[PDB]
Amino acid sequence: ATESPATRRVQVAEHPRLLKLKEMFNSKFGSIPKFYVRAPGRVNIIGEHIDYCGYSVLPMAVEQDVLIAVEPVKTYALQLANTNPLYPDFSTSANNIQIDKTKPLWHNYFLCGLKGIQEHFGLSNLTGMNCLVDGNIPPSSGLSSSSALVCCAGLVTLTVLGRNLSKVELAEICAKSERYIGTEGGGMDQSISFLAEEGTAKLIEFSPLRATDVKLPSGAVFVIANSCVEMNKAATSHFNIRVMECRLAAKLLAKYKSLQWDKVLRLEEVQAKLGISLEEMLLVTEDALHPEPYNPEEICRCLGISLEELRTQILSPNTQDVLIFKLYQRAKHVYSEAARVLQFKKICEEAPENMVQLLGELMNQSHMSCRDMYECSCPELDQLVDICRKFGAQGSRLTGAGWGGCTVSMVPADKLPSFLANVHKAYYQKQSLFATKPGGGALVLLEA
Template sequence: LGEHIDYCGYSVLPMAVEQDMLIAVGPVKTQTLQLANTDPLYPDFSTTANNICIDKTQPLWHNYFLCGFKGIQEHFGLTQLPGMNCLVDGNIPPSSGLSSSSALVCCAGLVTLTVLGMRLSKVELAEICAKSERYIGTEGGGMDQSISFLAEEGTAKLIEFSPLRATDVKLPSGAVFVIANSCVEMNKAATSHFNVRVMECRLAAKVLAKHKGLQWDKVLRLEEVQSELGISLEEMLLVTEDALHAEPYSREEICKCLGISLEELRTQILSPNTQGELTFKLYQRAKHVYSEAARVLQFKQVCEAAPDNAVQLLGELMNQSHRSCRDMYECSCPELDQLVDICRKFGAKGSRLTGAGWGGCTVSLVPADTLSSFLASVHEAYYQGNMSRLAREKHSLFATKPGGGALVFLEA
């Protein structure tokens, strides 16, 4: 739980799936970085190991590797790196909201660190990879990279930021999580959807801060407004109701609220691929973020208290999360909504989109004793009869337990 709130400064509650990304690597004496992929859909790529250039206009597969590589290079201030031959393999469905891109960035960072014979803590690696994935052009937070490194088998994690830390959250027995892929692919770096939401949250934070008499120009995240005011998330929802209106804000209205010019808005606040946006929904985005942050804490509390109806309570929080993603954050799509409805109809206690949205997967909480019938029913209702979905179902519908984080296997 915790969709689209990490980049707003709030804690999230993810678990790692059992699927993974693997890179076999061998250092070479030349300064050439040679990348190959076991999947023929992803062509080979070669470049010099120094002066890495990442093209933000084309989120090609190898650019995610280059993000992790460049992150380690810049962290240590290295100018001359050895070359590597790398073979990439993985069974995470791409563009499905299961963080295949972040897994590749993290794997590349770990591979580079290992070849260089250097050491960093898992927390340091997570922070470097979260920062370096932004080279691709998405203004994301750090949830995906953090769980990629800090995950432990058998437990979910509460991930907190500034400073980054992780706490075990034991999930209730008697239920399993099921991933179902809508088969609508969404690469968040290929559109402006994701960055527009980041910018709307940033603008909402600034307008809320100005409304409450805070130093708004220093504020970047919605969590900072709450911290400055020293009030609860529930109270922040009331502040949002009072300070923001539901109608979209024009650029001119935002400038009037903040007392700045259009040029200042464009050059000092908006990111390059959001400068063409004419309107911004501030109220809806802030409402989602503050309510979702509260749901994360409630989810953890339920897991810790472990009442008899824990699965039911957790399922309802997941359902609330999806409604908020759909209605307030507008990051769902018709196929995801259909799939969520199907999953609930056939016994899921809770179901929601996972990942950035606009396509990709749902995650559902399903009683363990009904798993077989649930999988069969969802297969028939969503995949059967649709040839394109059916062809991809092998990697599209599966139960998963909390998996472990990144590992290095050294050749004996």
């Protein structure tokens, strides 16, 4: 995988979104864009909250995305604008990139992406340009609009710079740079954005970053349903809490199994080190970790550390004062979840006479797990997932981080309309509810 992001040559006018964008850029900057860039958002089919644990996921890119009209400038001046009034213009000319985790203002996600590229190539000077941002992904809704902006911003930067990177590399870089926002997430979102391929789903693996086509089942529609509960990951610690929780769990797991925990960072590492299977890993966990919650002193104790080292050498800023750590539950979640993913696939590769039904299950399982073990669901998500089921839903589960956001659901061909209607009907009574297909990845667009 040395292939880079593609370059579509276009006649602007044939693309309404584009020409519009072109028109407003001009209005905003007195010039026309030199080029454009898009990076889709995505739907995680299954395998939630395990990317950061080193485990493989199965998402697919959505068609919604972030489109940026770009114009390079000779100055050290970065001017960002957004077609959406909710997103104020932003400018800077500083080589020193200042990202505020205090109020993740939209523009900061753009800076993460730009900043990562600059650093990748050891650059200090700000890359001057004018950009008009245009995203159609519902914000803070589980669809990775943050990552779309991130990746898009990165691609743009690289293009302006006129340097080259593989899609992989891009994904890898944008996975790390997004953290500048304050989130300690994995790499599923960026990887799918850069690696997506139309008409197929992907099994994204990590270390090494790899993607593998996954042919979806033949008779069901994947339907995104937005709970309508907004979750801004960067605005709230829940996420990082879970990140810590697992990290801690893994360390303790290693300790127990007598490995080198000090080096351990992720849950899968433990499974790796032991040479055991997922199922076995579940038994380990069951032995190693007590259900009742762990505490900071107890933790310290177990590891032969100091609260200060905890705090210091291990904890996160936004997790320092946590009293309660649910190591057992998070691990139970993680380990099973990886197993489902590997399963779901395998199935997909077999095509059994009861495919959906099966897969459906796998999916309900993810949900409950996330719900009960990982505790990253919500009451709203909870109902939505039922109702869905209530109408045809062969598979329903929250998607993305959770705590609001969307849900994905395998509705079989024929119930769609009802689903659609009844759901619409129940929950609701295109924007919040709609069907999906495996979209393609990030691309450069040249008016040619």
